[PDB]
Design a binder for this molecule. Structure first.
Ligand SMILES: O=C(O)CNC(=O)C(=O)O
Ligand code: NI
Ligand code: NI
Length: 366
């Protein structure tokens, strides 16, 4: 029984044979990565942007140390730290981690992956990729007057010691994510969200042997993507991945939902509920933003229909799927747990109806 995170587990991982991520990912320049481009070719595979040129991505120089983070964030903040060899969550002060990080004699491999600093002084030092901000649901549809607290999952600071490892998972709410390495190196292990892979993943996630079974072996292809310093990786909706901090590293990233793969996003959300995921508490109002998106997407469809235009295939697919989700959450036998998530400014039953006829119409007049 070789368990995840251990020294033995890392020896194998570091010497295994993985098809190169180069087989599925698209490398491009910051300027080519546009909303327009993605609406044409879609966002179905990871995108690597080697140079931060034209991304709109701004951040401290490659010399920003873990020490500078203690200053700008406040060594007092209690952050979640992972005990890699045990694959268990812990809690430390940002001050203690930095003490532990800069200490040559590291007794345990500890990793920090959830430090969201948008509500801190260091926030001013980072501007996220324009494409993320452009596609982001929170950026485009979150009201300035909701009772719900706006979700802040756009700026995370990642720090890890060599050999820290994160097992296979799907980001909360099936969010896409942008990831930039400041210094050091991270190695991603990517798995395509095919119907077969999702099934196995959920099964692997609910099996007791999960920690002793490398999920990479359970699928046809597990791609290795090395993210070196200065590079920016963009992972799309539903992608199953694991990460290995190959060397002391500091990176930045953020998650975001969008209209390109709503179906997949909803699928992942439903799965996270079936598994009871602790990460799904970062996007606690996923259902709320979904109601907001449904209202905007309805307006757009109304506009195209009343003028004789046909919506792009993906938009109809996404709305059709969003309709199914909303209708599900409204079921008498389930609404008791979804009711509070419905926005004050929306009429649930009516919105779902308008959605049904606008979709039916598109189905008929086509
Ligand atoms: O820790 C890492 O290197 C990568 N982490 C993640 O992808 C995550 O937390 O969702
Ligand atoms: Ni992740
Ligand atoms: Ni978003």
């Amino acid at each position: 029984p070789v368990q995840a995170g251990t020294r033995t587990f890392i020896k194998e991982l570091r010497s295994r044979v993985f098809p190169s991520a180069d087989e599925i990912i698209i490398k491009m320049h910051g300027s080519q990565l546009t909303q327009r481009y993605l609406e044409k070719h879609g966002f179905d595979v990871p995108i690597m942007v080697p140079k931060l040129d034209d991304l709109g991505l701004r951040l401290p120089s490659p010399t920003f140390s873990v020490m500078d983070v203690e200053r700008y964030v406040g060594g007092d903040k209690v952050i979640d730290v992972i005990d890699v060899a045990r694959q268990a969550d812990s809690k430390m002060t940002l001050h203690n981690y930095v003490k532990y990080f800069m200490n040559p004699n590291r007794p345990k491999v500890l990793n920090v992956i959830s430090l969201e600093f948008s509500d801190t002084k260091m926030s001013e030092l980072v501007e996220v990729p324009d494409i993320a901000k452009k596609l982001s649901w929170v950026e485009n549809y979150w009201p300035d007057d909701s009772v719900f607290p706006k979700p802040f999952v756009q700026k995370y600071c990642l720090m890890g010691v060599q050999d820290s490892y994160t097992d296979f998972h799907i980001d909360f709410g099936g969010t896409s994510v942008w990831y930039h390495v400041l210094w050091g190196e991270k190695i991603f292990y990517l798995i395509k969200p095919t119907d077969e892979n999702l099934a196995r993943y959920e099964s692997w996630s609910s099996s007791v042997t999960q920690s002793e079974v490398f999920f990479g072996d359970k699928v046809d292809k597990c791609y290795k993507c090395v993210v070196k310093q200065g590079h920016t990786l963009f992972v799309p909706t539903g992608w199953i991945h694991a990460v290995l901090t190959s060397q002391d590293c500091m990176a930045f990233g953020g998650n975001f939902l969008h209209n390109l793969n709503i179906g997949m996003q909803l699928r992942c959300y439903e799965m996270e509920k079936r598994l009871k995921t602790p990460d799904l508490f970062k996007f606690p109002f996923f259902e709320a933003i979904c109601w907001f998106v449904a209202k905007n997407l309805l307006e757009t469809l109304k506009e195209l229909r009343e003028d004789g235009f046909q919506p792009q295939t993906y938009l109809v697919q996404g709305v059709k799927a969003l309709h199914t989700a909303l209708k599900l959450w409204m079921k008498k036998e389930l609404v008791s747990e979804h009711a509070f998530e419905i926005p004050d400014n929306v009429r649930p039953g009516h919105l779902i109806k308008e959605l049904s006829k606008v979709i039916r119409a598109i189905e008929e007049e086509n």
